[PDB]
Each structure stands twice: as structure tokens, then as C-alpha cells.
Amino acid sequence: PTTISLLQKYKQEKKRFATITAYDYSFAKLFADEGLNVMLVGDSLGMTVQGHDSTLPVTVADIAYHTAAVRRGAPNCLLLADLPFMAYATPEQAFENAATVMRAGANMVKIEGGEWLVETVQMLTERAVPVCGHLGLTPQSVNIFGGYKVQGRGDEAGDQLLSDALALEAAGAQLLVLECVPVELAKRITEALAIPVIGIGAGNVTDGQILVMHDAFGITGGHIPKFAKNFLAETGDIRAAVRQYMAEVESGVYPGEEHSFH
């Protein structure tokens, strides 16, 4: 079975690895059959699956529904499940909601934010729940930011994110997702932290990559995000698209400069 141990090993080897979102049996099974064995059941489903204009409406029950479907499709994958908006407002609530998504199939939970989470991370880890951190453009805070804007620009913002990343790691987070930050900051965080750092919109300097699968096969309409690539476009079939994604991540061909912020 694919474990957190394996990703830590890949970091020690400087072997860049691919990860992907998934929300149903069919895609989860397709990814697993191609050897893409790290999947995130993310509250991005609020948008790509449910059709809301933010991730805030997603509930813990919604995550648990999609987590079970993904687990059925990929019984041996490493499965990260988001805790959605206001599902980790106190350590007690975090314990309850983490347990719901883990009992539904997840191996790890992902929660958004910085140093305020330290206690929650320490206590979750102690209670058998592995935690993936999430910094930068954390979409649950879209209303605070006033939009989906690049974070971590400026010495002060950058320095806050570095210290948050170190705090989460010291609290026991075993992975970190870094979203839409300058590549120069992503490199600094990746070098500073012993745990694996998984980037989206953070350039090819991270230890791993994530993408929303709907951007990845041009299912999503309009212009895809700057940081995303349609791998279906130039393979012909979805399985081939998956394999191209895996190989470009490992070689560092993806993300390219065109997919990165500064």
C-alpha cells in the first residue's frame, strides 16, 4: 500500500512525484491502474463537482461520500481528504470531523492555515490522524483575501509563510501543500522543511505536484489556470494523459516556467 513513508523516501532521493484530485470510483480506478497512487479528495469538489463559485458550501459529509467512492476505486492508494470550511474550528471538532473522513477511507487529512493550527495538528497526530498542511492561496479564505490571488509576495508575507511551514512541520504535519506562491518562495520552503512539499502553482521546485484532474483533461471550461496543463490535448486518451503527467512531473518538465508565478 502507498504510504506517507514512501513520499518521505522520494524526498530523500530527490525523486519528484505526482499527485492528483479525485472524487469518484471511475477516475480513482483509472489513476490507480496507471500507477498514480496519491489522490486528494479535496473541497475543490465544491466547484468542479457541485458547481458552487467557492469551496465553502462543501460539508464533511460531502467529503466522506466522495472519499468512500475514491477508496472503492483505488483500494491501495494513499488517500488525503480535506477538512472543509469550519470543520476544524476547535481541536474537538477537528477530531470528530477527521475521524469521519478517515473512517470513510482517508489515510490523512488536509487542513488550511498557519501557526494557529499548531495545537490542532499536535493533538490530531497524537490521536492517530496524519495531517497534511496547506499554505499560500488557501481557498477557504477567499473572502478574507478578496479573491483567488497569488500569496507570499513581499518579504513579510514570504517570511510568515516560511515560519508557518516550519511550525506545521514541528507540530507533526507529515506533508505540506503549497498553493500559488512565487517559485522563489516555494524553493525556500522546500529546502527549509524535511517533510515533503507538494506544489500547485508553486513551480517545479517542490518535492511533488498536485492538480485538479478536471483541469488536467480539459474537462473544465474557459481558460485553464496559468499553473495547469491539459495533458489530454496531446495524448489522445485519458490514461496516456495520466502517464504523461507522471513522467513530466518526475523529469521537472511540468510545471514549466509558463506555469509558475514570480
- Contacts with Mg ion in 16-75 (CB under 5 A)? 42-43
Which residues ranging from 82 to 141 are in contact with a copy of itself (CB under 8 A)? 85-86, 89-90, 92, 95-96, 98-99, 102-103, 107-108, 112-113, 116, 123, 125-130, 138, 140-141
69 binds, among Mg ion, a copy of itself, ligand KPL, none (CB under 5 to 8 A by kind): a copy of itself
Q: Which member of 118, 166, 167, 219 binds a copy of itself (CB under 8 A)?
A: 219
Q: Are 152 and 182 in contact (CB under 8 A)?
A: yes
179 noted as active-site residue: yes
- What is the number of other CB atoms lying within 10 angstroms of the CB of residue 72? 13
Using only C-alpha atoms, the chain has a radius of gyration, in whole angstroms, of 17
Q: Which member of 12, 33, 119, 170 binds a copy of itself (CB under 8 A)?
A: 33
Pairing of strands 108-110, 78-82: parallel
Q: What's the CA gap between 235 and 243, in Å, rounded?
A: 9
Q: Are 20 and 31 in contact (CB under 8 A)?
A: yes
Q: How far from the centroid of its chain's Cα atoms is residue 36's Cα?
A: 14
Catalytic residue among 34, 92, 119, 179: 179
Q: What's the CA gap between 252 and 114, in Å, rounded?
A: 28
Q: Is 160 in the site for a copy of itself (CB under 8 A)?
A: no
Instruction: Detail the residues annotated as belonging to a binding site.
Output: 43-44, 82, 110, 112
Instruction: Detail the residues annotated as belonging to a binding site for Mg(2+).
Output: 43, 82, 112
Residues labelled as active-site residues: 179
